[PDB]
Short mmCIF file of all heavy atoms in Angstrom, two decimals:
data_model
loop_
_atom_site.label_atom_id
_atom_site.label_comp_id
_atom_site.label_asym_id
_atom_site.label_seq_id
_atom_site.Cartn_x
_atom_site.Cartn_y
_atom_site.Cartn_z
N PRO A 71 32.91 -15.23 -12.01
CA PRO A 71 33.94 -14.25 -11.65
C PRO A 71 34.84 -14.75 -10.50
O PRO A 71 34.46 -15.67 -9.77
CB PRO A 71 33.12 -13.04 -11.21
CG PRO A 71 31.91 -13.66 -10.51
CD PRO A 71 31.68 -14.95 -11.29
N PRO A 72 36.03 -14.16 -10.28
CA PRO A 72 36.93 -14.52 -9.18
C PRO A 72 36.38 -14.04 -7.81
O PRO A 72 35.56 -13.12 -7.78
CB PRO A 72 38.25 -13.83 -9.51
CG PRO A 72 37.81 -12.58 -10.27
CD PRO A 72 36.61 -13.08 -11.07
N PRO A 73 36.83 -14.62 -6.68
CA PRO A 73 36.38 -14.28 -5.32
C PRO A 73 36.24 -12.78 -5.00
O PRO A 73 35.25 -12.38 -4.38
CB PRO A 73 37.36 -14.97 -4.38
CG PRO A 73 37.77 -16.21 -5.16
CD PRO A 73 37.80 -15.71 -6.61
N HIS A 74 37.18 -11.93 -5.43
CA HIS A 74 37.09 -10.48 -5.20
C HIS A 74 35.89 -9.85 -5.91
O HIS A 74 35.14 -9.08 -5.31
CB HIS A 74 38.43 -9.78 -5.53
CG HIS A 74 38.88 -9.87 -6.97
ND1 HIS A 74 39.72 -10.83 -7.51
CD2 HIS A 74 38.64 -8.94 -7.95
CE1 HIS A 74 39.98 -10.50 -8.78
NE2 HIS A 74 39.32 -9.36 -9.08
N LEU A 75 35.62 -10.23 -7.17
CA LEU A 75 34.44 -9.78 -7.91
C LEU A 75 33.16 -10.44 -7.39
O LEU A 75 32.13 -9.77 -7.33
CB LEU A 75 34.64 -9.98 -9.43
CG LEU A 75 35.48 -8.87 -10.11
CD1 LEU A 75 35.77 -9.25 -11.57
CD2 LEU A 75 34.75 -7.52 -10.13
N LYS A 76 33.20 -11.70 -6.92
CA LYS A 76 32.04 -12.35 -6.26
C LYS A 76 31.62 -11.53 -5.04
O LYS A 76 30.43 -11.26 -4.85
CB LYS A 76 32.34 -13.79 -5.79
CG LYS A 76 32.56 -14.82 -6.91
CD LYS A 76 32.75 -16.23 -6.33
CE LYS A 76 32.95 -17.24 -7.46
NZ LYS A 76 33.00 -18.62 -6.95
N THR A 77 32.59 -11.08 -4.24
CA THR A 77 32.36 -10.25 -3.06
C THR A 77 31.76 -8.89 -3.44
O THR A 77 30.78 -8.47 -2.83
CB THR A 77 33.65 -10.05 -2.24
OG1 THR A 77 34.20 -11.30 -1.88
CG2 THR A 77 33.38 -9.30 -0.94
N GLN A 78 32.29 -8.21 -4.47
CA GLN A 78 31.73 -6.93 -4.94
C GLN A 78 30.28 -7.10 -5.42
O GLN A 78 29.43 -6.25 -5.15
CB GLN A 78 32.61 -6.34 -6.06
CG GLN A 78 33.97 -5.82 -5.56
CD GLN A 78 33.84 -4.62 -4.62
OE1 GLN A 78 33.91 -4.74 -3.41
NE2 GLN A 78 33.65 -3.43 -5.14
N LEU A 79 29.98 -8.20 -6.11
CA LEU A 79 28.63 -8.53 -6.57
C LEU A 79 27.69 -8.79 -5.38
O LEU A 79 26.60 -8.21 -5.32
CB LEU A 79 28.73 -9.71 -7.55
CG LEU A 79 27.50 -10.00 -8.44
CD1 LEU A 79 26.28 -10.51 -7.67
CD2 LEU A 79 27.10 -8.78 -9.27
N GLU A 80 28.11 -9.57 -4.37
CA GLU A 80 27.29 -9.79 -3.17
C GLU A 80 27.05 -8.49 -2.40
O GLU A 80 25.95 -8.29 -1.89
CB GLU A 80 27.88 -10.87 -2.26
CG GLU A 80 27.67 -12.29 -2.81
CD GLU A 80 27.80 -13.33 -1.70
OE1 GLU A 80 28.96 -13.71 -1.37
OE2 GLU A 80 26.75 -13.72 -1.14
N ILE A 81 28.02 -7.57 -2.33
CA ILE A 81 27.84 -6.25 -1.70
C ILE A 81 26.76 -5.45 -2.46
O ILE A 81 25.88 -4.85 -1.83
CB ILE A 81 29.19 -5.49 -1.61
CG1 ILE A 81 30.07 -6.17 -0.53
CG2 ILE A 81 29.00 -4.00 -1.28
CD1 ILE A 81 31.54 -5.74 -0.57
N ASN A 82 26.77 -5.49 -3.80
CA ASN A 82 25.73 -4.85 -4.63
C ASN A 82 24.35 -5.48 -4.37
O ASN A 82 23.36 -4.75 -4.27
CB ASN A 82 26.13 -4.92 -6.11
CG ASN A 82 27.03 -3.77 -6.52
OD1 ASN A 82 26.58 -2.74 -6.99
ND2 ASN A 82 28.33 -3.89 -6.34
N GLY A 83 24.27 -6.80 -4.22
CA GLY A 83 23.03 -7.52 -3.90
C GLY A 83 22.52 -7.15 -2.50
O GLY A 83 21.37 -6.71 -2.36
N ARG A 84 23.38 -7.24 -1.48
CA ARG A 84 23.10 -6.89 -0.07
C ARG A 84 22.59 -5.47 0.11
O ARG A 84 21.70 -5.26 0.93
CB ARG A 84 24.34 -7.12 0.80
CG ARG A 84 24.59 -8.61 1.10
CD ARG A 84 23.59 -9.22 2.09
NE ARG A 84 23.67 -8.58 3.42
CZ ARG A 84 22.67 -8.29 4.24
NH1 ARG A 84 21.43 -8.57 3.96
NH2 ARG A 84 22.91 -7.70 5.37
N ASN A 85 23.07 -4.49 -0.66
CA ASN A 85 22.58 -3.11 -0.58
C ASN A 85 21.05 -3.00 -0.84
O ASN A 85 20.40 -2.14 -0.25
CB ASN A 85 23.39 -2.20 -1.51
CG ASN A 85 24.57 -1.57 -0.79
OD1 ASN A 85 24.49 -0.46 -0.27
ND2 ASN A 85 25.69 -2.24 -0.71
#
Side-chain angles (χ1 to χ4, degrees):
Chain A
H74 63 267
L75 279 173
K76 292 184 179 186
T77 304
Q78 290 294 99
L79 195 291
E80 285 200 277
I81 288 166
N82 274 267
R84 284 288 297 142
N85 268 267

